[PDB]
Design an enzyme around this catalytic site. Structure first.
Site, PDB file in Angstrom:
ATOM      1  CD  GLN A  99       2.669 -51.521   7.017  1.00 23.94           C
ATOM      2  OE1 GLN A  99       2.478 -51.171   8.137  1.00 23.94           O
ATOM      3  NE2 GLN A  99       1.647 -51.885   5.908  1.00 23.94           N
ATOM      4  CB  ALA A 101      -0.506 -38.173  -2.376  1.00 20.71           C
ATOM      5  CG  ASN A 145      -2.377 -57.276  -2.354  1.00 23.29           C
ATOM      6  OD1 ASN A 145      -1.303 -56.999  -1.800  1.00 23.29           O
ATOM      7  ND2 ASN A 145      -2.915 -56.242  -3.106  1.00 23.29           N
ATOM      8  CD  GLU A 165      24.790 -62.335 -14.734  1.00 17.06           C
ATOM      9  OE1 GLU A 165      24.210 -63.474 -15.280  1.00 17.06           O
ATOM     10  OE2 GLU A 165      25.887 -62.325 -14.051  1.00 17.06           O
ATOM     11  N   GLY A 191      -1.603 -46.105  -4.402  1.00 16.40           N
ATOM     12  CA  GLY A 191      -1.472 -45.267  -3.657  1.00 16.40           C
ATOM     13  C   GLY A 191      -1.015 -43.789  -4.197  1.00 16.40           C
TER      14      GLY A 191
HETATM   15  N1  LIG Z   1       1.631 -55.929  -0.539  1.00 19.57           N
HETATM   16  C1  LIG Z   1       1.298 -55.279   0.600  1.00 19.57           C
HETATM   17  N2  LIG Z   1       0.417 -54.294  -0.101  1.00 19.57           N
HETATM   18  C2  LIG Z   1       0.009 -53.227   0.617  1.00 19.57           C
HETATM   19  C3  LIG Z   1       0.590 -53.078   1.963  1.00 19.57           C
HETATM   20  N3  LIG Z   1      -0.095 -52.063   2.537  1.00 19.57           N
HETATM   21  C4  LIG Z   1      -0.745 -51.489   1.518  1.00 19.57           C
HETATM   22  N4  LIG Z   1      -0.822 -52.060   0.358  1.00 19.57           N
HETATM   23  C5  LIG Z   1      -1.372 -51.821  -0.851  1.00 19.57           C
HETATM   24  O1  LIG Z   1      -1.040 -50.608  -1.352  1.00 19.57           O
HETATM   25  C6  LIG Z   1      -2.350 -49.626  -1.827  1.00 19.57           C
HETATM   26  C7  LIG Z   1      -2.772 -48.604  -0.819  1.00 19.57           C
HETATM   27  O2  LIG Z   1      -1.696 -47.454  -0.829  1.00 19.57           O
HETATM   28  P1  LIG Z   1      -0.577 -47.486  -0.031  1.00 19.57           P
HETATM   29  O3  LIG Z   1       0.464 -48.532  -0.332  1.00 19.57           O
HETATM   30  O4  LIG Z   1      -0.929 -47.079   1.352  1.00 19.57           O
HETATM   31  O5  LIG Z   1      -0.450 -45.936  -0.663  1.00 19.57           O
HETATM   32  P2  LIG Z   1       0.912 -44.812   0.129  1.00 19.57           P
HETATM   33  O6  LIG Z   1       2.020 -44.584  -0.925  1.00 19.57           O
HETATM   34  O7  LIG Z   1       1.008 -45.072   1.441  1.00 19.57           O
HETATM   35  O8  LIG Z   1      -0.415 -43.516  -0.084  1.00 19.57           O
HETATM   36  P3  LIG Z   1      -1.729 -43.601   0.623  1.00 19.57           P
HETATM   37  O9  LIG Z   1      -2.703 -45.009   0.292  1.00 19.57           O
HETATM   38  O10 LIG Z   1      -2.529 -42.603   0.035  1.00 19.57           O
HETATM   39  O11 LIG Z   1      -1.362 -43.233   2.238  1.00 19.57           O
HETATM   40  C8  LIG Z   1      -3.364 -50.835  -1.920  1.00 19.57           C
HETATM   41  O12 LIG Z   1      -3.483 -51.527  -2.971  1.00 19.57           O
HETATM   42  C9  LIG Z   1      -3.145 -52.031  -0.779  1.00 19.57           C
HETATM   43  O13 LIG Z   1      -3.333 -53.147  -1.273  1.00 19.57           O
HETATM   44  C10 LIG Z   1       1.556 -54.078   2.834  1.00 19.57           C
HETATM   45  O14 LIG Z   1       1.760 -54.274   3.859  1.00 19.57           O
HETATM   46  N5  LIG Z   1       1.660 -55.112   1.595  1.00 19.57           N
END
Ligand SMILES: Nc1nc2c(ncn2[C@@H]2O[C@H](COP(=O)(O)OP(=O)(O)OP(=O)(O)O)[C@@H](O)[C@H]2O)c(=O)[nH]1
Ligand SMILES: Nc1nc2c(ncn2[C@@H]2O[C@H](COP(=O)(O)CP(=O)(O)OP(=O)(O)O)[C@@H](O)[C@H]2O)c(=O)[nH]1
Ligand SMILES: Nc1nc2c(ncn2[C@@H]2O[C@H](COP(=O)(O)CP(=O)(O)OP(=O)(O)O)[C@@H](O)[C@H]2O)c(=O)[nH]1
Ligand SMILES: Nc1nc2c(ncn2[C@@H]2O[C@H](COP(=O)(O)OP(=O)(O)OP(=O)(O)O)[C@@H](O)[C@H]2O)c(=O)[nH]1
Ligand SMILES: [Mg+2]
Ligand SMILES: [Mg+2]
Ligand SMILES: [Mg+2]
Ligand SMILES: [Mg+2]
Lengths: 428, 426, 426, 428
Positions: free
Chosen positions: A15, A90, A197, A245, A134
């Site tokens: 994203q 995962a 966040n 750098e 994640g």
């Molecule tokens: N900054 C930001 N953080 C995000 C976003 N979407 C999810 N997160 C963070 O990511 C973590 C959740 O894991 P994901 O990024 O979904 O991990 P993944 O690699 O997709 O694996 P799964 O969660 O198991 O589907 C949490 O700590 C969320 O706060 C986003 O759009 N922006």
């Protein structure tokens, strides 16, 4: 030459990438199809008559997020084989990311990466986006890092890690995932830029006047930081900065490469006309704890290395004076073994404005990369969190059943402890 | 990708299941005999999770309908929406168990099992990627309790790594629609203990209460009650069927919510429970939803979360929201009255946010709690078993079907152990 | 910011409260079922003080309606403007106290309390910043007196620093609508003594007199009487709801008007009390208003301020005025006949001037007096109690509900002490 | 350089500020948006292309008054973050202003103040507006004063205090609030200019022919005084005066810095055409008790220091002669230890006329700042008022419950007594 390639892992990685790439397209006059209406070469390749294409790779052990990419505003920007998907995620299990499920997809992505490298002439590095919490963003990333080390031991690898503060936690097993992955990250990353966040949310409410931030909102800001970072590579400046750098200038010691990025000015459309946007002013804003992208306790620690990346209309003299002023302030503390603390970089491009955006057009902007001892506190709290959970073997069954052994956790913990100790030491 | 098998065993399961199918079809724009009336590409995209697609763009549930009593099957088909089901997925015996668990589990269940097994195998091999199973049934009756558990066991033998979900209705002390409920419950819960990944505990009494006092309804029918259950079911799996901002499948919840293998009994709750005359006097919003979800009144299992502690909670929200807002609400809930949140698990809240809200309302939440208060439910049952077993009452019927005293003793022991474990962690 | 909870207990409270709601809604441009008909941004700005705002820009009072007798609730709903109230804020028991304070305070009140408490908590947590509470009720009856005080106590336990306001109707000697009024009054006033910040004392006799002689009305109904009370209520809180030149909230008045914790019984008065045929022969002006406010005729409590002294007075004026003029008037009032103003408190007058006048009239004043003459009211009651208690008359009913002689003795003692204190400072 | 920043505290502080700033805008040809159509630099900063912005900060522990500012004629003059509000007021309780409620908002305002300082180059001082009788204007102001002392011990701080005469008192506990705050004020203020409402009212009826003065009316006059004070900073004169000068010239002794400001001529539209507006005449008017802004018993005391700030067309010789004449009059008494009593300042700007105003355009005007021993009487009466109330512990519960101790009151009283004694002494 000097090209650089983006890798997006897991939902967070994807994203963020979405916003970033959109921003880039707007910056270089690239419409969402791919035609333009050189500088940009470092991020976009060319094939055919006029079409430009992102040097980017998107990885997810699940099709959901990347399916949206496939069928959205930017469907035509990416060739379908730079998007890899299709399987069981995962399920917030590091082990699955690393052992069971990472194993099946790795080769395909690695081939793609190699191809991308081969397309280019002497690319400097890789920009890796992911979360620590994640299962994919943790387990898979480490595996990928390993692969990259194997292939190109020499080249630079930078990452954008979405780091979890305990108060705004959205996942139960965030502590395990973060710790395991961080150990693996340690040996193969040149530097990792942490984003919190909660901090972003705070920034949004106070300085953008938005009470209800969405994830979409948050990502824009992050993208701007990225742009600020790499603008020196993409554009003509007065004084320039590259990926090489950063490694040189932020890392006193091999293990201590976790600096915070801050950004200013962050202003609503309304507030700008009652704003004297000064070079000094933005610098000042940069060292105020309310503007940090990680909640870290900045005043308690000391600063080790600080990179200031200005963009827009700037007089170098003014910047110098601002720096001097900052130095002269007593409460901000640098380590005694580094007298001169600021790397300074200038870029003639004004930062861009996103259609339907939250951010006002500004003529001067700055992104500061800063390494402080205070960030060690974050790790301490994470370790504390881990320690209680570990004590009862809570959620251990899930990990053991995925081909991960129990002593590994202990080892990781030990490593983290050692790291923490190290920060304590270097701050003396 | 990520495709699911639904199963409905016994009367309750069959009716609840029907309701569920009606709901989900409605959500994805499918008509009863009609092939497709959907309004959005999104609906189309993930039809293959629950459905198959014959020629001329028809659609059919991966659902299996099972009962030892033929009558209920008849009812199901006879209803409107009955033509959508593939006739080969109706798999019924000849004579019902008659609230004898042993019959369900030995004499007729065994005879029934093979056909069911064959159909499940067929379903599996048909599809590219198999995710999990969803069984709806009771613990109070002979078929849902006895045969169901046998079926589950069989499934486990075949695919050890796949996900097992069950939506299990539970006995309540004041209202017993069968006198042998203690026995039936005991035997089936033992079986569940070893072969299920997550089990959703649902009480009729609680549902009745909700209908009476919250929805302000004088005349609740079974259908109405079942509606809530259906909604809950829909909520759980919304992450698989729609693109969100944060996505959590069956597996994700399971991993998040089970600290120890044994403790996998989840208490569902739902929001918002609005009445017909009463809805226009609420500002629809995150905080209100959050407040509603943690009231003892909106626990579908008839246990008071005030007398236990939450190990973990999963919150699945549907409709557009500020994730930040949600998180802050969660924080507020946690810090303010941490009195019922376990200390060793630091953050006890899991969040999933999906963009597509149900038909009717603009924002909604499903709450899935792993609470130590669930031990209370088991305790009463145990007590009742003890009361019966001391006088050897109604043992003879069970004996007549192959069962022996030892089994009863063992299951009870297991239950006791389970209870103890819950207590310890409280 | 600065948001308030309204509560109405017993018959009187419910009816008065209704009237109040009608008035304030009218003032802020709100229709009965209709969402909004307001003419000014100002009205819009501070709707959130007393109201909540559901979808499609609806509006709803933060009001709670309580009674042990179901009938009055029925009446309230049945009236026009009854659809505006949230149905969940109607909280009534089954059988009325029947002018037995003990019943109000123990047997039925206790059973009732929990629901009320829950709703109040809900109301609190909903809103960002909680200012205070406003209770309307009687001291002569069982519910308003007994249950009300219990409720207040409960509230106090929860939020010790928040503001407590009560509008309490009081017994009069010549007209008694219940024979057990001395007892009821005594018990409830004791309770008030410890848990209220400010209490507005209101007499029916006085109101009747006003209607007869000043307004020149032959046929006063309860509604008419209640009107004055409603107006008074509106006046008190005008500082919270509108921008003025000088602003005084609930807290400000309280701080200004209570020299000692015990002495927090305020006698309200109001201006101008004009008749229908008589209004066109007056020049509308500050001085006239001021003169009207300090007449014994316009004290809503049936006590003569001629036989006591003012400790403090608060004057809240609505409509455009010259502050200077007001101040000079105040000075005139003070210096000319300082005979009834306490020497140790140098300036005994508090002024608040709010720009938005009520609907109907162009300038208006509310007067809130802390007068030592209030002791007279208590004295008669005390005497009556003494008269009854010596013969043990009607004690048996109270005994039957848990009460004992000691409580009566204690409350009376407290009352006596209070009386003495007032005297001392006179 | 030489910039100066205004702080408005409580209702009184805000409403005064409203008039003052309006007046300023009219003076410098600034429309209510912010565009002009340098001199003014000392009060207004510039940002953007053409927009000018007040160096002002508005503080209130309640949103009511400042909400009107936000949505009024001058909504666009102020950036939203120079207006701080939102909470429960110090309900005429000094303690709340100082301890409970002051604590929560202080940091935000202080940051703003610092920012304002940093925007400017070497600002001279601060102008603080408030009442003594308000809980906010009393308790909070002292706290703020403390903060300012801590930050900038060197810099000048002037205040405009709305002082209560006992006959026109609008609040019950005015005596306590005034006494407590005054003690705190004593150590950290360079000088405090007292204004009495009653006096203003008197002036309005007699010399402006208005029977019904509103608060709005009163404030205009006050604003004019302020303008007169600071005109020398904003404009070219013949002989100039600054904030530093006032401190030097009005304060014989550290503790004795409470002078009265008077203003003339105060004339209706009608009376001017039958008026020989003389330099001497206005001076004469200046020393007549009916023109005092504080009701003080001026003839009984002696004058210690007197500053005369003329504005408009003036011949210095004439002024000198007027001064001489004044000196020669017998009844007006100066202290024997100061022979030469007048600081004289001249300004080429005619004072301004407010659209829809009460005041006639005049070609010569004067504001006199004068320090007399007579003002001690006011304190004596206040102390008397306090003493009776204190005697019975009236209203003490409210203060004790807010984290204020009882001996504090006693201490304050003692201090006031000592101050009173001091005035008595220096007058010999
Ligand atoms: N900054 C930001 N953080 C995000 C976003 N979407 C999810 N997160 C963070 O990511 C973590 C959740 O894991 P994901 O990024 O979904 O991990 P993944 O690699 O997709 O694996 P799964 O969660 O198991 O589907 C949490 O700590 C969320 O706060 C986003 O759009 N922006
Ligand atoms: N939630 C619901 N629960 C039900 C419904 N109908 C029955 N029940 C409950 O289920 C319990 C028994 O389940 P069944 O009716 O399916 C009897 P079962 O088929 O399991 O075995 P046999 O009795 O041998 O047929 C009964 O005691 C009720 O408490 C329903 O529509 N919804
Ligand atoms: N100001 C008003 N006073 C009233 C009104 N109706 C009754 N009263 C007074 O209130 C007194 C009794 O109060 P209630 O009628 O509410 C009886 P309550 O509910 O308090 O207890 P129960 O008698 O046990 O129901 C009675 O003696 C009257 O003097 C009214 O409309 N307005
Ligand atoms: N000159 C002048 N005095 C005022 C004005 N408004 C209020 N006052 C005076 O200020 C005192 C009341 O205090 P406020 O200024 O309202 O105090 P605050 O800081 O707002 O705190 P609260 O009074 O508690 O709301 C009284 O002595 C009033 O006479 C005004 O517009 N002009
Ligand atoms: Mg994902
Ligand atoms: Mg059946
Ligand atoms: Mg009644
Ligand atoms: Mg105020």
């Amino acid at each position: 030459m000097r090209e650089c390639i983006s890798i997006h892992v897991g939902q967070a990685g994807v994203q963020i990438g979405n916003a970033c790439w959109e921003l880039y397209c707007l910056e270089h006059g690239i419409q969402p199809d791919g035609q333009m209406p050189d500088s940009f070469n470092t991020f976009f390749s060319e094939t055919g008559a006029g079409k430009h294409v992102p040097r980017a790779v998107f990885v997810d052990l699940e099709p959901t997020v990347i399916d949206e990419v496939r069928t959205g505003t930017y469907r035509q920007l990416f060739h379908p084989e730079q998007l890899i998907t299709g399987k069981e995620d995962a399920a917030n299990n590091y082990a699955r990311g690393h052992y069971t499920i990472g194993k099946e997809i790795i080769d395909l992505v690695l081939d793609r990466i190699r191809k991308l490298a081969d397309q280019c002439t002497g690319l400097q590095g890789f920009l890796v986006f992911h979360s620590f919490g994640g299962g994919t963003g943790s387990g898979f990333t480490s595996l990928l890092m390993e692969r990259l080390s194997v292939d190109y031991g020499k080249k630079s690898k930078l990452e954008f890690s979405i780091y979890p503060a305990p108060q705004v936690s959205t996942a139960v097993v965030e502590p395990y995932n973060s710790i395991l992955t961080t150990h693996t990250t340690l040996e193969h990353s040149d530097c990792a830029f942490m984003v919190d966040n909660e901090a972003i949310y705070d920034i949004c409410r106070r300085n953008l006047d938005i009470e209800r931030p969405t994830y979409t909102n948050l990502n824009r800001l992050i993208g701007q930081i990225v742009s600020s970072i790499t603008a020196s590579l993409r554009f003509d400046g007065a004084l320039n900065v590259d990926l090489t750098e950063f490694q040189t200038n932020l890392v006193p010691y091999p293990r201590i490469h976790f600096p915070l990025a801050t950004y200013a000015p962050v202003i609503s459309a309304e507030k700008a006309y009652h704003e004297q946007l000064s070079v000094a002013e933005i610098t000042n804003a940069c060292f105020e704890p309310a503007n940090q992208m990680v909640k870290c306790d900045p005043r308690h620690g000391k600063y080790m290395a600080c990179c200031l990346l200005y963009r827009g209309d700037v007089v170098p003299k003014d910047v110098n004076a601002a720096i001097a002023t900052i130095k002269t302030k007593r409460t901000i503390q640098f380590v005694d073994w580094c007298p001169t603390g600021f790397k300074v970089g200038i870029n003639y491009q004004p930062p861009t404005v996103v259609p339907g955006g939250d951010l006002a057009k500004v003529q001067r902007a700055v992104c500061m990369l800063s390494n402080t001892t205070a960030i060690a506190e974050a790790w301490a709290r994470l370790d504390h969190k881990f320690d209680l959970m570990y004590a009862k073997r809570a959620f251990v069954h899930w990990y053991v059943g995925e081909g991960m052994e129990e002593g590994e956790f202990s080892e990781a913990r030990e490593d983290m402890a050692a790291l923490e100790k190290d920060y304590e030491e270097v701050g003396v | 990708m990520r495709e699911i098998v639904h199963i409905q065993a016994g009367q309750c399961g069959n009716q609840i299941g029907a309701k569920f199918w009606e709901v989900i079809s409605d959500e994805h724009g499918i008509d009863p005999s009609g092939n497709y009336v959907g309004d959005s590409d999104l609906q189309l995209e993930r039809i293959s999770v629950y459905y198959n697609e014959a020629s001329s763009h028809k659609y059919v549930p991966r659902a299996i309908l099972v009962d030892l009593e033929p009558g209920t099957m008849d009812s199901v088909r006879s209803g409107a929406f009955g033509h959508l089901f593939r006739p080969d997925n109706f798999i019924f015996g000849q004579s019902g168990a008659g609230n004898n668990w042993a019959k369900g589990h030995y004499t007729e269940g065994a005879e029934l099992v093979d056909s069911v097994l064959d159909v499940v195998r067929k379903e599996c091999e048909n599809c590219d990627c198999l995710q999990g199973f969803q069984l709806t049934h009771s613990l109070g009756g002979g078929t849902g309790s006895g045969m169901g558990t046998l079926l589950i066991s069989k499934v486990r033998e075949e695919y050890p790594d796949r996900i097992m979900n069950t939506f299990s209705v539970v006995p309540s002390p004041k209202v017993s629609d069968t006198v042998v409920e203690p026995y039936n419950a005991t035997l089936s819960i033992h079986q569940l203990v070893e072969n299920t990944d997550e089990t959703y505990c649902i009480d009729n009494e609680a549902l009745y209460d909700i209908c009476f006092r919250t929805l302000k309804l004088a005349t609740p029918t079974y259908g109405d009650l079942n509606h809530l259950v259906s909604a809950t079911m829909s909520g759980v799996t919304t992450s698989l069927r729609f693109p969100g901002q944060l996505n959590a499948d069956l597996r994700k919840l399971a991993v998040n919510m089970v600290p120890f293998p044994r403790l996998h009994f989840f208490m569902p709750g739902f929001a918002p429970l609005t009445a017909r005359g009463s809805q226009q006097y609420r500002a629809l919003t995150v905080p209100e939803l959050t407040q509603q979800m943690f009231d003892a009144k909106n626990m579908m299992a008839a246990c008071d979360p005030r007398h236990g502690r939450y190990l973990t909670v999963a919150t699945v929200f549907r409709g557009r929201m500020s994730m930040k807002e949600v998180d802050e609400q969660m924080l507020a809930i946690q810090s303010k009255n941490s009195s019922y949140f376990v200390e060793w698990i630091p953050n006890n809240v899991k969040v999933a946010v999906c963009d597509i809200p149900p038909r009717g309302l603009k924002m909604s939440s499903t709450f899935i709690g792993n609470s130590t208060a669930i031990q209370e439910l088991f305790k009463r049952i145990s007590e009742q078993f003890t009361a019966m077993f001391r006088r050897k009452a109604f043992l003879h019927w069970y004996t007549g079907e192959g069962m022996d005293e030892m089994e009863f003793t063992e299951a009870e022991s297991n239950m006791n152990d389970l209870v103890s474990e819950y207590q310890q962690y409280q």
